[PDB]
Amino acid sequence: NKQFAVIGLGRFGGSICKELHRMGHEVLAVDINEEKVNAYASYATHAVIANATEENELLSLGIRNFEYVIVAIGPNIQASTLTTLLLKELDIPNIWVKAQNYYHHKVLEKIGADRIIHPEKDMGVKIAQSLSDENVLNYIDLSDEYSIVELLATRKLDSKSIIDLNVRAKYGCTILAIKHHGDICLSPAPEDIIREQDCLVIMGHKKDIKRFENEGM
Template sequence: MKRTQYAVIGLGRFGSSLARELTKLGHEVLGIDQDEEAVDEMSEVLTHVVVADSTDEEVLRSLGIRNFDCVIVAIGSDIQSSILTAILLKDIGVPLVVTKALSELHGKVLNKIGVDRVIFPERDMGIRVAHQLVSPNLLDFIELSRDYTIAELSVPKRMSGRTLKDLNLRVKYGCSVVAINKKEGVIIAPTANDLLEERDILVIIGTNSQIESFENEVVK
């Protein structure tokens, strides 16, 4: 697998967590922050770290930021710096700019200036937790877009011993099972004859309403 080069600007709680995980996944990560202490904390974790002002175009160019495959702007509370940094990155020619939004309005501005992806860590986590609270069988919930969702659902006892063909999810609900996580391993692209057991985890993709309909069926 190609080692993608990432740069993470802003090494606060979100940025440092993201940078650590990217490093664990085997990618090269450059960490950038104006706070020397934050940079020192990540110096032995990331591929490279540097104390720098990301709102200075010359500084960004000197770091060779244009050569990175993806740059994530994870600046904590300074909306002005976040927006200016994103503008500079797009102007310099970074292929993929992902920016953390601090509010809906901030997100709208980022979209207006052409950021490739805007993320709302606190809001998105809140949505996932809400779904998990409402449906005990729902283990994880990721909104792929405004309309599509991928969800992990635990197989209840009453569905144990049935096959995917028996459940007939595609016809009844319109959603698809893309994987089954079993004790002995994960089945990717399962067949209609794959047997389900209690506590297996179904990975399902579909529209939000399709997933919701199936959730309601599961928890009956």
Template structure:
């Protein structure tokens, strides 16, 4: 059974979500106050409508409570984002994800009913910053304010050593949750597993511990 999604706000972020969900075969209702934006997504989403999401009656008419997940991706109009989130929460929408423009915005929507808040610009900035520090850092994903998960290439400092030898958990407070080589992923690898060139470690931990792990084991001098 296909899940039902509604995306409110069809800017760069909301539009990207709309495209990806539709590509995965999901039923998507695309909503924006701009006729041009809605026309752009008429042939992408299951339905695309011009609507003011700050009008409770309008959202009721659209049957917004019937959707499994509503994404509030309104761009620069923080007031509209907050009012929309309040209405969705009061209507009892099952799951509400809100794009936050800043930390203040995030705090407010968290308090008024958002189930999940995303910071696309900030998160992308962090990912890019980590990737340009070293070619060995492949990806960086924030899990919470203090914890993240990072994908790193096995560096020359690690090749030929086992997880026991490196003792990453004891020395850096991080956990290696998987080892990837190509398309093969070894979840919960054995402690005596010897690391090879071209392998990728998937590591989880606090931001402070991950930073120390990257500095001492991952980043290599050019």
């Protein structure tokens, strides 16, 4: 299908490998720690003990063949950077590397990483957003001003109808989905009821959504 190499079976890397394996892709799980290789042996096509900073080992893995290589090493800047460099000189098409800090990001950038990810930082931003606003369970920003938001329904919304809560005119936002007891309602009709503690999916302008949050719920 498509070949993926996950170097560094951490939380992040391990998750990548496990999920990708669940999707049914050819995933090579590489780690210097034997116990990590042993741990993700069930969740990969081939799990190998290797020092990714050692070139001959990298050739012994046959990494040149892979379309995507992911360096999920993030506290050892040295190892990460070095590995990325090795892969670059070996003409790997796509090199995705975790990064630790702004300068590690810089060095990855300069040695030609294709995509640099900061999982902890981004998730930090998200969870902080959820912290300052208890109503938001999840969300996605369409742009600087427009967003789709998932909200936890309060008592103020219990037994209320979509036509009762006229968001499309009063607030310029549109409701997309209602999740009740695990059951799911997509693009619901105005007659539908929202019960408390249910998942509500609204879409619109950020400020408008906050307006609805304040006065509605």
